Amino acid sequence: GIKNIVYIEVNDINPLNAGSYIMDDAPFFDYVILFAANIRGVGSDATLYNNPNVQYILDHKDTLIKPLQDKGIKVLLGLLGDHTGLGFANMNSAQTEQFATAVANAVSQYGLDGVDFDDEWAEYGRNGYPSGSTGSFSNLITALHNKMPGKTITVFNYGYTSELTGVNSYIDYGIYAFFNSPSWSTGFGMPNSKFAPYTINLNSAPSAASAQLYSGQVASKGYGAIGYYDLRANNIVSVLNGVAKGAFKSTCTYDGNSYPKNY
Ligand SMILES: [Mg+2]
């Protein structure tokens, strides 16, 4: 069936809010991305950096991640550039393996269900790192695939993703990077069934009817996912119920839980 994939800006929003939405006695959301841990170049090293918000969530996996997983939601660690000049796309071979290993170790250590790649904000070329692509982004996907074959990889369709066609068998879903209007196409050779061509911004939300009509079109054309970006702690059930009607011939309800972020 169609998968609902939501990115939570964990600098702002407690991720438990994704579990407050119910459709058919199950969570409306199928995948939650904790957006985001960072790739950072530190000298010759490619490093995985968790900011204080991300690290807090990982340190509290049993109370901020596991409650979602216990409901059946798959929780992914988002991966994002962070202004160092090193990103997913300009690593050498050693750096690629180093970063793949750091990511796999975090997925294992924190009991996560996989990762999402958003090749954004790396600022390619700073600090003496290569200004252009080395082809590492495909090699990074392959390396993670081999390390965690049973875990999910999603790709937010931004940055050097045009390079990923050859490794797209290792990517579960790609997600359109612009909001509130479909683009009836996919990135990096993905089939309809592995792509979200429509991504709703849940902060600057469209009308429920807009979501209902577009999500009905997504379903009719056989796409495999709908994207959601920036779920907040307000009750946005009207929009999700629109999708429940349009794409799932169902309804979405809210359990009342607005979880604050006080860490
Ligand atoms: Mg509105």
Author numbering: 44 to 79, 80A, 81 to 201, 202A, 203 to 225, 226A, 227 to 306
List sentences quoted exactly from the publication behind this structure.
The genomes of Bacteroidales contain genes encoding glycan-degrading apparatuses that typically co-localize in discrete clusters known as polysaccharide utilization loci (PULs). B. thetaiotaomicron contains almost 300 different GHs belonging to 60 different GH families, and secretes at least six mannosyl-glycoprotein endo-β-N-acetylglucosaminidases (ENGases, endoglycosidase hereafter) that hydrolyze the chitobiose core of asparagine-linked, or N-linked, glycans (EC 3.2.1.96). Here, we discover an ENGase from the GH18 family in B. thetaiotaomicron, BT1285, encoded in a distinct PUL with its own repertoire of proteins for catabolism of the same HM N-glycan substrate as that of BT3987. Altogether, our data suggest that human gut microbes employ evolutionary strategies to express distinct ENGases in order to optimally metabolize the same N-glycan substrate in the gastroinstestinal tract.
BT1285 displays the typical (β/α)8-barrel catalytic domain found in other GH18 family members. BT1285 is a 30 kDa enzyme composed of a single GH18 catalytic domain with a TIM barrel fold typical of ENGases, while BT3987 contains an additional β-sandwich domain in the N-terminal region (DUF1735). BT1285 and BT3987 share less than 30% sequence identity and populate distinct clusters in our SSN data, accompanied by an RMSD of 2.4 Å between both ENGases, indicative of structural divergence and suggestive of the functional differences that we observe here. The main structural differences between BT1285 and BT3987 involve the length of the β-strands of the TIM barrel (particularly the β2 strand) and the presence of longer flexible loops in BT1285, with higher B-factor values around active site in BT1285 relative to those in BT3987, which decreased in the presence of the HM substrate. The overall architecture around the active site and substrate binding pocket exhibit an RMSD of 2.4 Å between these HM-processing ENGases. We identified two aromatic residues surrounding the catalytic residues that are interchanged between the two B. thetaiotaomicron HM-ENGases—Tyr315 in BT3987 is in the analogous position as Trp164 in BT1285, while Trp355 in BT3987 is in the analogous position as Tyr201 in BT1285. BT1285 exhibits significantly higher affinity and faster hydrolysis of poorly accessible HM N-glycans than does BT3987.
